[PDB]
Amino acid sequence: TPQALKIIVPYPAGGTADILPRVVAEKLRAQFPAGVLIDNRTGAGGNIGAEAVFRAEPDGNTLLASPPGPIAINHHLYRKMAFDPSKWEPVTVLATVPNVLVVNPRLPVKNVQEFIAYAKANPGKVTYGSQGNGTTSHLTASLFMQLTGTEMVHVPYDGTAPALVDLVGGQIDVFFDNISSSLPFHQAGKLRILGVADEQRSAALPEVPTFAEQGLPSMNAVTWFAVVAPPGTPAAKVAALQKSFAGALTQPEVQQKFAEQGAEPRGWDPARTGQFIRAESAKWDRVIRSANVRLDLEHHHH
Numbered sequence: 046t047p048q049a050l051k052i053i054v055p056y057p058a059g060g061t062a063d064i065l066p067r068v069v070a071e072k073l074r075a076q077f078p079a080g081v082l083i084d085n086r087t088g089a090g091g092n093i094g095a096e097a098v099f100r101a102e103p104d105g106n107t108l109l110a111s112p113p114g115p116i117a118i119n120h121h122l123y124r125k126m127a128f129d130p131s132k133w134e135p136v137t138v139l140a141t142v143p144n145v146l147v148v149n150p151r152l153p154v155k156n157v158q159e160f161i162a163y164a165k166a167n168p169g170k171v172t173y174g175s176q177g178n179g180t181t182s183h184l185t186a187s188l189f190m191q192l193t194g195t196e197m198v199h200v201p202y203d204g205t206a207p208a209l210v211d212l213v214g215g216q217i218d219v220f221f222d223n224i225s226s227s228l229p230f231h232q233a234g235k236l237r238i239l240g241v242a243d244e245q246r247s248a249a250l251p252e253v254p255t256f257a258e259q260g261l262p263s264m265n266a267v268t269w270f271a272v273v274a275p276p277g278t279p280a281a282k283v284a285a286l287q288k289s290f291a292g293a294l295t296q297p298e299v300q301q302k303f304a305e306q307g308a309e310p311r312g313w314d315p316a317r318t319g320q321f322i323r324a325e326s327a328k329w330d331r332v333i334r335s336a337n338v339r340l341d342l343e344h345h346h347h
């Protein structure tokens with residue numbers, strides 16, 4: 046008898062991890078008359094909510110919709126975890142979204158090179174927020190520091206939303222967020238985006254140069270928002286779910302809300318999604334080792 050589709054998002058409401066599945070869910074209600082429920086489950090950089098899905102019954106009624114940390118990245122930083130992301134059953138990728146460098150407006154910097162010089166002038170003093178250990182914002186900051194020889198202080202939060210509160214407030218200095226969540230802040234001059242970590246500019250921010258344009262072509266850091274099912278979820282179930290998500294993503298209300306905030310809808314099939322997750326896991330391993338990425342197991346609140 047009918048069950049609501051339960052989607053855990055392992056980050057606080059407000060950021061891109063929460064908004065993209067919520068936008069999609071509005072057009073899935075069609076194939077799920079009992080409802081599509083988003084359940085935010087915060088902490089440990091995404092791992093609390095991930096654990097909850099990993100142990101859920103593998104019937105495809107409980108899914109994780111997450112950015113890369115608890116899917117492709119975290120397992121490279123934790124020697125002992127409570128779940129094994131290699132055992133997720135991939136469903137789809139909802140979207141890819143480039144990361145950016147975004148700064149508090151009172152920082153006296155107008156581009157990436159001026160920020161490099163400012164961090165060198167203040168070695169070990171500039172703070173970068175992150176969305177949590179092993180999130181793309183954490184690793185993107187690490188990459189930047191390796192490529193530029195800068196030394197900054199990690200201030201981990203539990204997702205984008207609390208990090209942006211403190212960035213706007215001036216309690217931290219910089220953050221390597223994704224463009225979608227930082228965009229409205231930049232548009233209103235509440236934050237300043239200095240560069241886009243992709244090979245082309247974003248159509249959502251056509252006036253902001255890439256990092257490649259500004260002298261750092263290895264700053265390619267495009268995050269993504271995937272859906273995974275518990276270990277053992279049947280292949281035919283993951284296939285049907287992917288088809289439903291793909292259909293929602295082509296609905297003009299969804300497509301259009303993604304595109305307006307610089308998110309590229311994907312809708313990839315399960316096997317393509319698995320291949321992509323493994324490639325991304327290998328890509329971020331290389332960053333972790335090259336940039337000597339370390340955990341910060343102290344907690345921060347906005």
Ligand SMILES: O=C(O)c1ccc(C(=O)O)cc1
Binds near residue numbers: 057063
């Ligand atoms: O690892 C990431 O890219 C990522 C992590 C958290 C959030 C969020 O809190 O919305 C978005 C993206």
